[PDB]
From a paper:
To reveal the structure of MjaRNase P, the reconstituted MjaRNase P holoenzyme was subjected to cryo-EM analysis using a Falcon III direct camera, resulting in a well-defined electron density map of MjaRNase P at a resolution of 4.6 Å. The EM reconstruction revealed that the MjaRNase P holoenzyme indeed adopts a dimeric conformation. The resolutions of the cryo-EM reconstruction were substantially improved by applying the two-fold symmetry, suggestive of a very rigid dimeric interface in the MjaRNase P complex. The protein components of the MjaRNase P complex are arranged into an elongated configuration, which can be divided into three submodules, one ([name]-[name])2 heterotetramer at the center and two [name]-[name]-L7Ae heterotrimer at the ends. These protein submodules are intimately stringed together and serve as a long, extended holder to accommodate the two RPRs through a highly basic surface (~6500 Å2). The ([name]-[name])2 heterotetramer mediates symmetric interactions with two [name] molecules, which are organized into an extended, twisted Z-shaped configuration. Both termini of this extended RNA architecture associate with the [name]-[name]-L7Ae heterotrimer. The C-terminal long tail of [name] sticks out of the main body of [name] and folds into a β strand to become the edge of the β barrel of [name], defining the key linkage in the protein decamer. While [name] only contacts one [name] in the complex, [name] is involved in electrostatic interactions with both [name] molecules. L7Ae specifically recognizes the K-turn and helps stem P12.1 fold back onto P12.
Author numbering:
A (entry chain H), I (entry chain G): 3 to 121
B (entry chain J), J (entry chain I): 2 to 117
C (entry chain D), G (entry chain C): 2 to 227
D (entry chain B), F (entry chain A): 2 to 127
E (entry chain F), H (entry chain E): 1 to 95
RNA sequence: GGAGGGGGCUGGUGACUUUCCCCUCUUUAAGAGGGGAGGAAGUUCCGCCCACCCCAUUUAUGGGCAGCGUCCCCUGAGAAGGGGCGGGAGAUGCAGCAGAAACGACACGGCUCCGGAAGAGAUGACGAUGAUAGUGAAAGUUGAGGACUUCCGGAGAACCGGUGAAACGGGCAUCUCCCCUGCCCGGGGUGCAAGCCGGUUUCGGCGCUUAGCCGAAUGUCACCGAAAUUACAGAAGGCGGGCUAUAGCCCCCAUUUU
RNA sequence: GGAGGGGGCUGGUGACUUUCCCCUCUUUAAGAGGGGAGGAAGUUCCGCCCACCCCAUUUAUGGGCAGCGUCCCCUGAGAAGGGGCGGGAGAUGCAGCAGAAACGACACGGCUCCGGAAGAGAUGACGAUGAUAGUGAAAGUUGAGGACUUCCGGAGAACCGGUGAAACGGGCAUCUCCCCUGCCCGGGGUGCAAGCCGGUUUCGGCGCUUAGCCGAAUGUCACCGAAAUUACAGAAGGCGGGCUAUAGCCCCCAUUUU
């Protein structure tokens, strides 16, 4: 248990330094180099069975594996008419992934119901 | 809590609220500030700190750093909308034309000192 | 050129330095060793011109409970050496892979020195066989012949499987000290002049590795300076 | 227990079995003929030549006998059998009958005619 | 942090590495950071910009820590970057 | 008269002169040190190995001594000096000093410093 | 395969034929030989299955007066054999060039067997050196070593100058008879397996030439029939 | 008269000579009289008429006497016909 | 002395059989073969220092060495006018040798003087 | 004594003396018998045995054998000249024409039997 | 030119000794001649000849093998190595957590209709976390004196599910049958230590050998050659195929280098 | 293709050991590097450098060497090996036997002249073993009623001597001078065991070494190569020439053979 937790403290940095090295190389223009780093990061996650950080979770297309720089190779928008969600689409391959916030939208509905009943 | 990169002092925090109220030529919304930074007319982007969920403004610090647009944070979402001119809170406000606040927006550009 | 003997006085140690020897080994054949023998042995080394490496000894205890015990005792000394004629003690000594050398497989068992399967476990564990010369000194005619045919069987297994061989006089008094050249000539007598020369190097190559490991902060063959 | 694995035939020793006979009037014991051979090897071979030859006596009932030596050094140990001259009141003269690679050919060429296989039948029974 | 004990479990990618001893005479003296890593081959880009193919088993590397310098053989560094994190123990002897 | 022509140097034997010393408290005679060497050659070399080595002692006054052996077999006879353990009440331990091709280098390298040439001056005078 | 021994009875002669021997030599070591010993020795040869060649012996007389005497005695027997440790007797024996073999150069002189100049006069006179095995049978440890180093000096002169070598047991009683194979193995022990085989042929090649010379009318290697 | 004892002093010229053994295979089996003689070469003319060159040292000759036949080696027959009459003694041994 | 006389009995036949073999080969036509035999006969005479027979003395020219056959290669005549002598001349080379009998002519002169004085 | 090759009987010896006296067509002298044998007209050559010196008739037997002319010997030199018709002795007589002695000269040709 | 990988070949001649073994011959007992371990003999994953028993005497049924080269996938300095051979139907499994839902589809949440409650007619409710609002409603363009709603429960045509390796829909793996094309027919079970014979527990012989041992033989030296007794390794009824370890030289490829 | 003869080459690299030796260097005494027997070192037939003494200080005289390749002679299967270098004069030797006579020529026997004796004038003497008889008379042609002689002794122009290896005439061998042509000038004697030095009999050092020992070192293994440590053989101040013994391969020649 002690050697498992100390290895998890090591491997938490190994997904952190390899992803931050991928971020500064992706703005250089070498998209094939940044795809190599996260492929090592996606491979080292499943051997230890550890999860990705919440900040670096939405930065990678799940289909191809290119790092998404907002505006450079990524087109992000807020579509909130029907259901509130943000969409990331890779300009290289063309896959589409979305992040709905309906569970956080449900709280402000429930918070405003409690404010109307109290007032 | 997560997307905030630097701690903003309280004495300069009102100066972000003073610059938006003096100018009153602004774009409100999370989509309109994203269109302003990619075109390059936006000189200063003001982001609230107490947003929930954080994903609606998480791309704002990473887009402002690559485009070269100065930005800083404000702790209150409701006070940003009141200085912008709305009763409803706005998550983010970008400035196009300062007008009288052109002398003030250079003093907000000392946030680059807070970056290093 | 490394010698293993028991120090008594200054005059026999002054005699071995005058002829051929470069550095030798203090051989504490007891369960009672301390710094009192260690502060004297540095005075003999700095007396004329010498360097001594002190080692300890354990003998005839159980298989695996001796392994937990001598691993605590080796942290205070330089090297260790295990002897035993029982095959279950000889087999258990090589698995721990922290021992450097092993001696006396011919005087306790009186059947055969090294088995075929015993040499294969000494390969990846890197345990050397130590040859002794105190044995042939006080035998009879046929008794000198029996240990010599046991030694010829130990040379062919150490040559094929590449097991290191280190000679020792295993001396006790002033005059059982021999020179390295007749010891080289006795190993040149048995098999080869080439294999007799490499034995003296494996005597030397052990004491550099054991010293440099505990000299500085070296862990798993990695040294850290600056 | 004392059990050693037998060496492979590439690594095992090469041996020959010396059939001989002591032809005289007096009698000899098994403990006497193992001693006079061992005294003969230390005089001719020396202490170094003994390990090269590995002499061994297996069995002695008749004036005949079977002796073990190496395959490369049958020639030197056969001269060791003839140089021993006397045993304390009485001469020695060993006459060899022949050598072979096994007990099976040595027991039927000069010693006898039939084959007894005694090592197999006393090990499993006792 | 980067320690000499956990340097066998550390990721070599993103560390300045120079080689002091090698059997091949060309590979001695090059300095740079490691970009990619395979089982028995390190990829180091120089400050000049030349990508050089370095096998691990034939040379010894000098790693640059936060200030410190550590000398570790590449014979301890056998393995892919995936399975080296979990459990890889190697024993070397200088004979 | 007994006179033999010396063999030519192509046919003559190749020899080395072993300088040694017996370091002890008790004293040894010339007849004792020629006997303990001859008992040591018959145990180690054997009767066959003695003619191959041709051991000979020339001179013994001090605890030092000079011994003769063949050039090819200096290695086997040096192991014969160390295996002899005792002489009837008292141990033996021969320490060698070095070997050379002649008396002239062996007498000045380890034994002494000067050169006496005694074999020439006692033959023509006596 | 030729043996030289002294016949006493029938049983030891019947024993040597059963093992390896083909034909052997009667060795009359006396100055009194007649046909009485010759009529008995043909009865032992025709007893089981054998062929015997009888020879005589002379010992320790003068140099040149012995040569005129034994040349009369050789006309009645088959072969002769001269022994002597004195060098003036050893030198005078080879010049007469009618003797076949010579023995004992090591027990009478006790200094050296064959000289360098003695081997060169044996070349054109064709006199062989005979090696003896009766000597090593009743010596001591160092005494066996001295005759063996004398024999090794006699082998190198007979190999370089091509002098024939014939072995003999030189036996006296029933049990000093040896087999040829250990005698071959003892000569294989000394120098070579090739030179040990040629010695048995020079034992054979002598007794054919001496027989065929006096068999028919052969004078100076020329035979006349019809 | 011609005797086997004086055949080494006898003149070979005018005697029928045939060869039984020789190292060369062609010289075995020829019969004829000797016409000329040198030191180590006999000259024999056949009944066919072919002059054949025969060395002495390599073969053995069978001489035809008045009725008798004598077998003598040519190794005893070394020498010119001049000095062989005066004194020539040779010793041979079959080893 | 005994070995010298027995060798002289041998060598008297060696000049006799070698000369008679030269005589029968000289009529065959091979004059070079007959010259070889007498050259061996002239050589073997001077080593032993023995003399030629009186019959075979006048048969050989002393210059060249060819056997003289009377009429074939030899022209013999009796010239008795001035001094009585017979002359042999070789037809091959051309040398001239003569045999005077003046000492035998002197006896018949002395024999006829004793017959005239007695009568 | 030397040049005589065969012993002549006494009964045939007078028949040589009878053949020369009957014919009387003969050549006398040592030179004239040599000229007769090389031409081949001589059928029989008679040589005296008691000549001295022997060299004057020594070539007569060797020349008669090669030419194939039969010859025999007579013991007396004086009786040869008396049968030839001279008071002085002649050493040798050769016959050219026998005449009445042609029956006799075939009987003298049995000297070839005396030759073998 | 240097570490390495793959493929091929691995003996011949002469001498000694029947006391290294077998076989044959003659001969005053011993001699002469010939032959004598491999590419894996190791590993036992196989088949057949050979044997023995059971059912059957059948290409009617049915059983067994193959779909190669090529191509596909994975790993290394990318030469090379390893595995597999098409389709249809049925069943089970993809845990745990996460996700509306985890292998067939669904229920559930956004959309529409009905019922109940709350606020309100130049006001108030809501809305830049998106307002009346459209499109094949994944996605994308839109962006406010815009503006009539918000919540809960029930029923339904169409579209879409923040996770995770992998989803209103197609995959992956295993097992069993029916669809194919070609060839061959006794089908299973054990196995030479099988099986048979004198013997009748045990033993000897056979099965057994152009090496044929069994208390397990096949030896030593020299040399041309360069393929050589060096590495790995040693027969036990034979043959064929696959895997495993490597010496010497030849051929091919790579990297460093120039 | 097989016995044989002659000529040429005969080591290099790597490892071990200063306990195989020498030399050099540094260095907590031992390590590292380099070198280590030949074509004959054997044989002593030579010379010189090097040393010492005597005479001489001379190319005036005189001394020393060479006349090679080529050619001549002898011996073997006739390739090959060995010996010698022109001429003139003088002396000795070619024994013994044989021959008139044996090394300069002669005496002597056949030829001529003189003296003595014997026989004789159509006779007798002699003569086919040669008669009156010739030729530059060695040799060769001649050959009878041919025909006047035969013997001994002495003196002389021309020609020829049965033997023997070799002769009224030319050779051979040795020794000493005078004739030649070219080159070089101290001439002899001994010799490193010479000679010199501390020493003052004896010993150590020098003479001594790109191996330099001296009671006499130069070792062992592997390999390319094929010239290799195999044959013969082992330095003792160095170099040059000649003779002697032979291994391995290359080149040349012969015989047998086809
Ligand atoms: Zn993508
Ligand atoms: Zn002529």
């Amino acid at each position: 248990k002690f050697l498992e937790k100390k290895l998890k403290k090591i491997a938490y940095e190994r997904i952190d330094i390899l992803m931050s090295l991928a971020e500064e190389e992706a703005k250089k223009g070498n998209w094939d180099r940044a795809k190599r780093y996260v492929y090592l990061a996606r491979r080292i996650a499943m051997k230890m069975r550890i999860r990705f950080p919440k900040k670096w979770k939405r930065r990678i297309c799940k289909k191809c594996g290119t790092f998404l720089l907002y505006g450079r190779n990524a087109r992000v928008r807020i579509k909130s008419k029907r259901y509130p969600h943000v969409v990331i689409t890779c300009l290289e391959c063309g896959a589409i992934y979305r992040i709905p916030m309906i569970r956080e939208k449900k709280e402000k509905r429930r918070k405003k119901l409690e404010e109307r009943l109290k007032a | 809590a997560v997307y905030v990169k630097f701690k903003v002092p309280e004495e300069i925090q009102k100066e972000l609220l003073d610059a938006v109220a003096k100018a009153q030529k602004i774009k409100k919304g999370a989509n309109e500030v994203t269109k302003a930074v990619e075109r390059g007319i936006a000189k200063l982007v003001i982001i609230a700190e107490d947003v929930k969920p954080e994903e609606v403004v998480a791309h704002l610090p990473y887009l402002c750093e690559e485009k070269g647009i100065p930005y800083a944070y404000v702790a209150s979402k409701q006070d940003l909308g009141k200085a912008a001119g709305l009763e409803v809170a706005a998550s983010s406000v970008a400035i196009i034309n300062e007008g009288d606040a052109e002398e003030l927006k250079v003093l907000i550009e000392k946030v680059n000192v807070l970056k290093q | 050129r490394i010698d293993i003997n028991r120090i008594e006085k200054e005059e026999d140690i002054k005699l071995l330095k005058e002829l051929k020897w470069n550095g030798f080994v203090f051989y504490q054949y007891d369960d009672e060793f301390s710094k009192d023998r260690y502060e004297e042995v540095k005075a003999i080394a700095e007396s004329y011109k010498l360097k001594v490496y002190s080692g300890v000894k354990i003998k005839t205890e159980s298989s695996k409970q001796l392994r937990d015990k001598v691993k605590k005792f080796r942290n205070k000394c330089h090297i260790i050496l295990i002897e035993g004629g029982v095959l279950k003690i000889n087999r258990a000594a090589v698995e721990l892979h922290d021992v450097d050398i092993l001696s006396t497989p011919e005087l306790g068992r009186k059947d055969s020195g090294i088995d075929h399967v015993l040499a294969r476990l000494a390969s990846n564990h890197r345990v050397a066989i130590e040859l002794n010369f105190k044995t042939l000194l006080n035998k009879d005619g046929y008794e000198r012949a029996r240990t010599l045919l046991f030694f010829r069987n130990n040379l062919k297994l150490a040559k094929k499987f590449d097991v290191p061989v280190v000679i020792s006089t295993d001396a006790e008094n002033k005059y059982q000290i021999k020179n390295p050249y007749d010891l080289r000539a006795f190993l040149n007598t048995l098999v080869e002049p080439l294999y007799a020369k490499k034995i003296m190097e494996t005597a030397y190559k052990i004491c550099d590795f054991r010293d440099y490991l505990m000299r500085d902060n070296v862990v798993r063959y990695g040294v850290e300076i600056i | 227990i004392e059990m050693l694995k037998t060496l492979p035939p590439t690594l095992r020793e090469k041996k020959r079995y010396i059939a001989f006979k002591i032809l005289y009037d007096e009698e000899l014991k098994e403990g006497e003929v193992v001693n006079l051979i061992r005294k003969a090897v230390l005089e001719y071979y020396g202490s170094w030549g003994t390990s090269k030859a590995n002499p061994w006596l297996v069995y002695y009932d008749f004036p005949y006998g079977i002796l073990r030596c190496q395959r490369d050094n049958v020639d030197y140990v056969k001269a060791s059998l003839i140089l021993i001259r006397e045993f304390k009141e009485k001469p020695v003269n060993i006459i060899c009958l022949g050598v072979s690679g096994t007990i099976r050919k040595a027991k039927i060429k000069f010693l006898g005619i039939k084959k007894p296989k005694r090592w197999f039948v006393i090990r499993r029974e006792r | 942090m980067i320690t000499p004990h956990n340097i066998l479990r550390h990721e070599l990618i993103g560390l300045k590495v120079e080689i002091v001893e090698a059997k091949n005479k060309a590979m001695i003296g090059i300095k740079g950071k490691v970009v990619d890593e395979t089982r028995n081959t390190l990829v180091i880009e120089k400050e000049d910009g030349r990508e050089v193919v370095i096998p691990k088993d034939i040379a010894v590397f000098l790693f640059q820590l936060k200030g410190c310098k550590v000398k570790v053989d590449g014979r301890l560094l056998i393995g892919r970057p995936e399975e080296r994190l979990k459990k890889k123990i190697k024993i070397l002897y200088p004979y």
